Amino acid sequence: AMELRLTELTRLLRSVLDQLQDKDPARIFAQPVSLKEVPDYLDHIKHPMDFATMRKRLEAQGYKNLHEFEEDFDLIIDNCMKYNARDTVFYRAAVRLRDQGGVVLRQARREVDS
Numbered sequence: 001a002m003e004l005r006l007t008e009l010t011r012l013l014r015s016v017l018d019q020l021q022d023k024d025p026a027r028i029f030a031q032p033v034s035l036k037e038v039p040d041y042l043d044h045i046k047h048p049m050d051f052a053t054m055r056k057r058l059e060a061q062g063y064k065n066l067h068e069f070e071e072d073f074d075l076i077i078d079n080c081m082k083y084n085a086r087d088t089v090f091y092r093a094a095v096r097l098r099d100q101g102g103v104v105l106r107q108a109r110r111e112v113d114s
């Protein structure tokens, strides 16, 4: 029965995550930060996250509520604004994703509370 309720949540979160990825047309956040390109990344960042990793979790009914999903979105953003300096294409992409994504998530919070 929980999974019946949770099936509806998934559907809504799928749509939210699609909208979020559209706010990253550079695909900067679409997969794990490459450890080939950034061999020291896990020394800096203890909990990596990216949209593909969210999508896996989503499709395994791994998000039991919207807050768990927003936590992983926030990890993408916060990890990026820690690792990268402010003038970089990465930090600026994180700011735009945070700003544009917040609009999407504020509407999502309303639809969940229904």
Ligand SMILES: Cc1cc2c(cc1N1C(=O)c3cccc4cccc(c34)C1=O)n(C)c(=O)n2C
Binding pocket: 026, 027, 028, 029, 031, 032, 033, 034, 037, 038, 079, 080, 083, 084, 090
């Ligand atoms: C290369 C890289 C470094 C990143 C970073 C993302 C990338 N990066 C990839 O690792 C990558 C892997 C595979 C395909 C890709 C396609 C487009 C862009 C990236 C990409 C990308 O920016 N983020 C979010 C960071 O904070 N850093 C330091």
